[PDB]
Amino acid sequence: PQITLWQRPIVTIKIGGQLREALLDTGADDTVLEDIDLPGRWKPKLIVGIGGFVKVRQYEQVPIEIAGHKVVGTVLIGPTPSNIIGRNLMTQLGATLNF
Amino acid sequence: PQITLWQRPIVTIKIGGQLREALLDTGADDTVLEDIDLPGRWKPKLIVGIGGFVKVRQYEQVPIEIAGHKVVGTVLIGPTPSNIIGRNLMTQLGATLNF
Ligand SMILES: [Cl-]
Ligand SMILES: [Cl-]
Ligand SMILES: [Cl-]
Ligand SMILES: [Cl-]
Ligand SMILES: [Cl-]
Ligand SMILES: [Cl-]
Ligand SMILES: [Cl-]
Ligand SMILES: [Cl-]
Ligand SMILES: [Cl-]
Ligand SMILES: [Cl-]
């Protein structure tokens, strides 16, 4: 799609059977979602959040659909003020900012 | 331009004689710059930053060039971890996210 920016760029995402929403955030390096579960192994990671650092789970090679486009990449699961799609997945999408 | 996202989307900006850089941040509502001065009146505004709230100065109808494109809009001046161009100015640019 072509997404304008007069409102927050919130899109529908889907991971397996879990339909959610998230912000397309060009100011975020990584993707962080609070309201999803995944099975299997994961690696701990620290991100910055309230109180200094927050521990999240890093899941690799996750299939995720963003605004109807399927990609595969890393998803961080843990506390976040908003679900955010970061540059790691926007690169998979081939997304660009255009003006 | 057409800006890819495999690195942080940092662009050159210019306000009067003040040439700087800033991140194009679709996760930011407003534009916040730390390393610029402007003359004249301004209105105080609180934003979220380290320690809860940070006081910045709100300047209106500021002419600013972003990646070579001139626009006019509101610029917040104060502490910020990175200079950020937010959606308020990206809308003026007619910027879109495309995939
Ligand atoms: Cl599932
Ligand atoms: Cl992030
Ligand atoms: Cl620990
Ligand atoms: Cl959508
Ligand atoms: Cl990835
Ligand atoms: Cl100047
Ligand atoms: Cl902001
Ligand atoms: Cl006060
Ligand atoms: Cl530039
Ligand atoms: Cl504005």
Residue numbers in the entry:
A (entry chain A), B (entry chain A): 1 to 99
What does the paper say about this structure?
Protease (PR) is essential for the maturation of human immunodeficiency virus (HIV) and is a major drug target for treatment of the HIV/AIDS pandemic. Recently, we reported a multidrug resistant HIV protease bearing 17 mutations named PRS17. We demonstrated that purified mature PRS17 exhibits extreme resistance to all 8 potent PIs tested. Here, we present the first crystal structures of PRS17 in the inhibitor-free form and in complex with DRV.
In the absence of inhibitor, PRS17 crystallized in the trigonal space group of P3221 with one monomer per asymmetric unit. The 99 Cα atoms of PRS17 superpose with the corresponding atoms of wild type PR with a RMSD of 1.48 Å and the maximum deviation of 7.7 Å occurs at the flap tip residue Ile50. PR20 has a wide open flap with a separation of 19.3 Å between Ile50 Cα and the Cα of catalytic Asp25. For the lateral component, the distance between the Cα of Ile50 and Thr80 of PRS17 is 9.2 Å. In addition, the inhibitor-free PRS17 structure shows no conformational change in Arg8 due to L10I mutation. Different interactions occur in the inhibitor-free PRS17 structure. The Phe53 side chain has a single conformation and lacks van der Waals contacts with the side chains of M46L or G48V. It should be noted that while residues in the flaps experience ps-ns dynamics, as demonstrated by the heteronuclear NOE measurements, we found no evidence for relaxation on a longer time scale (i.e. no line broadening), especially for G51, suggesting that the RDCs measured for the flap residues can confidently be fitted to a single structure. Therefore, these results unambiguously confirm that the inhibitor-free PRS17D25N adopts an open flap conformation in solution very similar to that described in the present inhibitor-free PRS17 crystal structure.
